[PDB]
Design an enzyme around this catalytic site. Structure first.
Site, mmCIF file in Angstrom:
data_model
loop_
_atom_site.group_PDB
_atom_site.id
_atom_site.type_symbol
_atom_site.label_atom_id
_atom_site.label_comp_id
_atom_site.label_asym_id
_atom_site.label_seq_id
_atom_site.Cartn_x
_atom_site.Cartn_y
_atom_site.Cartn_z
ATOM 1 N N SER A 204 0.797 -1.225 0.000
ATOM 2 C CA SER A 204 0.000 0.000 0.000
ATOM 3 C C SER A 204 0.829 1.274 0.000
ATOM 4 O O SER A 204 0.237 2.360 -0.098
ATOM 5 C CB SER A 204 -1.005 0.020 1.142
ATOM 6 O OG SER A 204 -2.069 -0.862 0.833
ATOM 7 N N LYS B 244 -0.166 3.724 -2.727
ATOM 8 C CA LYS B 244 -1.254 4.688 -2.653
ATOM 9 C C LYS B 244 -0.739 6.122 -2.615
ATOM 10 O O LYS B 244 -1.493 7.045 -2.937
ATOM 11 C CB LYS B 244 -2.182 4.340 -1.481
ATOM 12 C CG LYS B 244 -2.968 3.066 -1.770
ATOM 13 C CD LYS B 244 -3.497 2.333 -0.549
ATOM 14 C CE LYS B 244 -4.270 1.107 -1.021
ATOM 15 N NZ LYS B 244 -4.414 0.032 -0.022
ATOM 16 N N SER C 78 -5.910 3.262 4.015
ATOM 17 C CA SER C 78 -5.444 2.205 3.126
ATOM 18 C C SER C 78 -6.591 1.455 2.465
ATOM 19 O O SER C 78 -6.476 0.262 2.179
ATOM 20 C CB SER C 78 -4.493 1.244 3.832
ATOM 21 O OG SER C 78 -3.466 0.862 2.952
ATOM 22 N N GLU D 229 -5.518 -3.125 -6.649
ATOM 23 C CA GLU D 229 -5.687 -4.039 -5.521
ATOM 24 C C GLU D 229 -6.428 -5.300 -5.933
ATOM 25 O O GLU D 229 -6.093 -6.398 -5.477
ATOM 26 C CB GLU D 229 -6.402 -3.336 -4.371
ATOM 27 C CG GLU D 229 -5.556 -2.264 -3.700
ATOM 28 C CD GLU D 229 -4.460 -2.836 -2.799
ATOM 29 O OE1 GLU D 229 -4.440 -4.068 -2.556
ATOM 30 O OE2 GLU D 229 -3.625 -2.043 -2.316
#
Ligand SMILES: [Cl-]
Ligand SMILES: [Cl-]
Ligand SMILES: [Cl-]
Ligand SMILES: [Cl-]
Length: 274
Positions: free
Chosen positions: A47, A50, A110, A146
């Site tokens: 993550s 991101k 997240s 994802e």
């Protein structure tokens, strides 16, 4: 200097406790000195990616293609089950959220569905990847959202970064190189307003330290944890800042040991600042 030799030796010793692939990059942001361990090696971001996603979105806000107040209509179909998603948990039948709220859920919490919604909004992983490369950040790849990352264990390794490539992005955030003051301030706000990774960068820092960061974590498969990461900008008591990236990868040690590597390295740099 013997001070930096001692620091470097301790980074190596702490990193060795993970018995894995450890990457470190730090910079004293105002002065410009840096230290790395395996700074050009490749690591799965999880993550952490991101952050480049959020920069790409906010760049489109600055250019006039998106607005932080624009309403995102989120359908149930876009809220994939199973995956980590505070949005889905609160709005299991879909909802309307402002772009700024989707960004906060994605970066601060997240959210994996928020992530994929944002990727779709900007034109996909291929768009974000070329945008980041256009910034001069070469040693990073963004190939999978994802949903695709969840489809198979190996996919996470296609979203890789070197410690230095992530450091580049942190330096660019710190200096406002990529984003207008308003968009950059917003990114820093959402990176500070997270409770993720209390045992990582924050693990051994004073609880009231200001830390703008993003964590990344894989599952543990066949005993191997692909990624235990934290990357961020720490404000020191003297008002200057450190950019710190720690990627702990491909190790069979437990979570306490993996996170402790990040926490102890981070406090080492905090204590080594004068
Ligand atoms: Cl995509
Ligand atoms: Cl690079
Ligand atoms: Cl696989
Ligand atoms: Cl254990």
């Amino acid at each position: 200097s013997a001070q930096d030799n001692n620091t470097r030796q301790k980074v190596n010793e702490i990193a060795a406790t993970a018995r894995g692939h450890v990457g470190v990059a730090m910079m004293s942001l105002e002065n410009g000195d840096t230290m790395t361990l395996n700074g050009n090696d490749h690591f799965p971001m999880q993550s952490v990616f991101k952050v480049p996603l959020a920069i790409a979105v906010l760049d489109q806000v600055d250019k006039g293609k998106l607005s932080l107040d624009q309403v995102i209509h989120i359908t149930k179909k876009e809220l994939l089950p199973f995956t980590w998603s505070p949005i889905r948990e609160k709005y299991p039948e879909g909802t309307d959220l402002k772009l700024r709220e989707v960004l906060a859920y994605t970066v601060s919490q997240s959210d994996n569905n928020g992530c994929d919604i944002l990727f779709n909004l900007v034109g996909g992983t291929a768009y974000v990847e070329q945008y980041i490369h256009g910034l001069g950040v070469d040693s990073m790849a963004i190939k999978a959202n994802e949903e695709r990352m969840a489809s198979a264990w190996k996919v996470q390794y296609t979203n890789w970064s070197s410690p230095l490539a992530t450091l580049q992005l942190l330096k660019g955030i710190h200096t406002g190189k990529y984003l207008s003051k308003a968009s950059n301030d917003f990114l820093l706000k959402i990176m500070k307003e997270t409770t993720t990774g209390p045992k990582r960068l924050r693990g051994m820092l004073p609880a009231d330290a200001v830390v703008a960061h993003k964590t990344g974590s894989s599952d543990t498969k066949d005993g191997l944890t692909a990624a235990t990461n934290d990357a961020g900008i720490v404000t020191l008591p003297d008002g200057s800042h450190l950019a710190i990236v720690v990627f702990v990868s491909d190790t069979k040690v437990n979570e306490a040991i993996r996170e402790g590597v990040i926490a102890r390295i981070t406090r080492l740099f905090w204590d080594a600042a004068n």
